[PDB]
Design an enzyme around this catalytic site. Sequence first.
Site, mmCIF file in Angstrom:
data_model
loop_
_atom_site.group_PDB
_atom_site.id
_atom_site.type_symbol
_atom_site.label_atom_id
_atom_site.label_comp_id
_atom_site.label_asym_id
_atom_site.label_seq_id
_atom_site.Cartn_x
_atom_site.Cartn_y
_atom_site.Cartn_z
ATOM 1 C CB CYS A 162 29.772 94.835 67.082
ATOM 2 S SG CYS A 162 28.555 95.305 68.333
ATOM 3 C CG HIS A 302 34.338 98.902 67.149
ATOM 4 N ND1 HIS A 302 33.708 98.045 66.275
ATOM 5 C CD2 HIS A 302 33.562 98.949 68.257
ATOM 6 C CE1 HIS A 302 32.597 97.592 66.829
ATOM 7 N NE2 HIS A 302 32.484 98.127 68.031
ATOM 8 C CB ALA A 308 33.486 103.647 77.898
ATOM 9 C CD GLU A 313 38.884 101.285 67.601
ATOM 10 O OE1 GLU A 313 39.110 100.477 66.674
ATOM 11 O OE2 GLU A 313 37.805 101.907 67.718
ATOM 12 C CE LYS A 334 31.275 100.509 63.716
ATOM 13 N NZ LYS A 334 31.565 99.878 65.018
ATOM 14 C CG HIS A 339 27.624 99.924 65.639
ATOM 15 N ND1 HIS A 339 28.562 99.254 64.878
ATOM 16 C CD2 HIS A 339 27.570 99.276 66.827
ATOM 17 C CE1 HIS A 339 29.045 98.243 65.579
ATOM 18 N NE2 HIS A 339 28.467 98.233 66.759
ATOM 19 C CG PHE A 399 27.417 94.621 72.613
ATOM 20 C CD1 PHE A 399 27.659 95.684 73.468
ATOM 21 C CD2 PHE A 399 26.712 94.857 71.444
ATOM 22 C CE1 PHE A 399 27.214 96.959 73.161
ATOM 23 C CE2 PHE A 399 26.263 96.129 71.132
ATOM 24 C CZ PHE A 399 26.515 97.180 71.993
#
Lengths: 411, 411
Positions: A162, A302, A308, A313, A334, A339, A399
């Site tokens: 990402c 993001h 989570a 963030e 997003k 995404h 990730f």
Amino acid sequence: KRRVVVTGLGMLSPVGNTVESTWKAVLAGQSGISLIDHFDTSAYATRFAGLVKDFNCEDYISRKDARKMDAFIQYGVAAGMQAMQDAGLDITEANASRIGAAIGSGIGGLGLIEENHTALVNGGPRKISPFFVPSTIVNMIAGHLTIMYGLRGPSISIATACTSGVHNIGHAARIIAYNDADVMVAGGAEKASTPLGVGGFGAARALSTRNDNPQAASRPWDKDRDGFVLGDGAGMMVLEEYEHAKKRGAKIYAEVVGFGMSSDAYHMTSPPEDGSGAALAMVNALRDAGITTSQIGYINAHGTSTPAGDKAETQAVKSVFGEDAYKVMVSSTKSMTGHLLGAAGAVESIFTVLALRDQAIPATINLDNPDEGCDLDYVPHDARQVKDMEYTLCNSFGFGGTNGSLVFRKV
Amino acid sequence: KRRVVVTGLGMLSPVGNTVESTWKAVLAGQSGISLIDHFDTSAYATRFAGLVKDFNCEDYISRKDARKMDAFIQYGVAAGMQAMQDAGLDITEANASRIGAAIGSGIGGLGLIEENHTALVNGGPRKISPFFVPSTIVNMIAGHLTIMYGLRGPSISIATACTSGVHNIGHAARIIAYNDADVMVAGGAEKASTPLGVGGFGAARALSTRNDNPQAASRPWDKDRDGFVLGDGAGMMVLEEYEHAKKRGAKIYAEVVGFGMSSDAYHMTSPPEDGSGAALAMVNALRDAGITTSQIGYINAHGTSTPAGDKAETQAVKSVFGEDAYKVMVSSTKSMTGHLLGAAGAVESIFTVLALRDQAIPATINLDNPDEGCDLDYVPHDARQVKDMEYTLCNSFGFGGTNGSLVFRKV
């Protein structure tokens, strides 16, 4: 020190096949989330995604060639061509060595890998396409674009899930700032809306399951988020050394002033509650810019609409900005696009650039109900118009615990 | 101005499971090419490859972790540890923010993509492993390593096919030199000996077909070369800033002094007959070093054993070095290892560094008959012993026409 600027934009997104159309759609809050219909989604828990509509690659690439490239390369090449015409550079023999590319992707040609594997299983190794490898591996977008335009400068392709788009843009600037290049095409492209892509993320239960209302599924920082929404597309920037752009008289969108990086060193998929790694990246981007927390108007977060992740963030934004946090506006586009993975950082970095130009900040659609410890100004439903804004912060946390941030300055 | 040095080595190759063992076999001219066994090669035209032998990943990591890794991640991680162990780094909290990773791969986890796809086809999206994505994408080597050792610094993964190793190392040095980090783990890993991998390159008719004599198949610059031999493995370096390395009393292997990049802008897989793209990269690495052509002793050539490719590289060496072309020694260790793709640039850069340490130059085996337009000193059959060599050049010229070269200095 060599200053780096944005002199050309191009993109394909779920809400538009051009930069301006996508930007309009973004400010008007239109969703690009649709139901998947190019493969049977009967057994899948998630049956929707952000898809690119009415895309004809025959405006950009002859079909003879487009059969030698996976869809994610087709998007990437198309968006690259947009940015090149938008830039309006003259490529000469004396120039070529100084123009290069930095284009990546998170997953790459999953689609064409699936095809060839089935062929192999059904018919043996001789039913594998002779262009298998060049059609699927991540760096082949830059491969196509360099050849198309005769770019003989540095050519790389960063693949960090990402964080691809941001890392590619960022290191393209480093390359230019180092005097290895004068011009760079940078960005990322992705199309992971395939059986294996949707299935893979589904098996990890990272996907939203709100099949009954697709366009409301992506709801970052809302109470009822249940995972991120998959999206396809491509974003591309032409980065340029500053004097070089003015000497030729280019349209100058913004300046790349800061690039910061970090890693979580925590878990392969989930982020830390504290958000130390995300915070670290922004602090670094800010130091690189020589700038304080109170000079930033807007943060393109993001904001993936994961339980989570969204909490992490915010906690990271509060940690870095202290309590300039509530004065600063933090939105994830997003909510509309979904995404995009490897293309996420590129497409969203364009919004932060356009935001400075138009002094308008996109909203976080579907934010009907704040979460427990989410109190910041997420620009809840409608696009604000702000004035005398000068610094933007673009975030992507991928990730593997990979974090990256870019700081743009109004020019 | 920040100088970068090598303070750690680790690698897995077809001729050894450690650095010193691999180095021994390379100097002794032992071949690592074997006939493939982890799938039926009855219908394949090429049935051999350079395989990592007697590798057990439970020596390095538990089997639960081992299970969520494609083989190329397993190799990369294992080599990563070797380098970290060799480096002897003390990881404290302050330290942690200043240490990162730059590890890539050309193709990534193709093997586990095949496995999960076959599962999907047989049983649907609910029989896809929940660790599909974290087990296959390129940047998960750096992901595991950062978590393992608590590295919080910059983390990237350059995926530029055959050039991955060199680009990763080079940009790791840039990151350090730009001061974004003090230490960097860098390198590449590859496992393309899969049914789809061998079939894919086989479909492109780029592979060797000398199944009757596998260990003589890879014969760069010979008249009867018929394509490259695919190889597996992983090479890794711990790069560090000179002051930081001395202050802690580190093992200093050599200095990273030059890094050059370019692109062919010609064809997707075949190189031009010059030379020009490869020449540019070498010239730029030379300029980066502040060094003349007459100061380089040895060139670890790309030398893949391909008709067009070998002739192109020679011509590229001619144009750049001129009169010193014949004074300079040029060998490819791919004669023994085969072509490791994204690990090629990593494993070979180690050879270029070890060459400086031991003042010994590996030969290019199977050079029975030099080609017509081949006039350079290729170190034909036996490892040569040399003295006073201070500079080495490592070349890698990969698909997509992306080129790279690193310059190392004895210190």
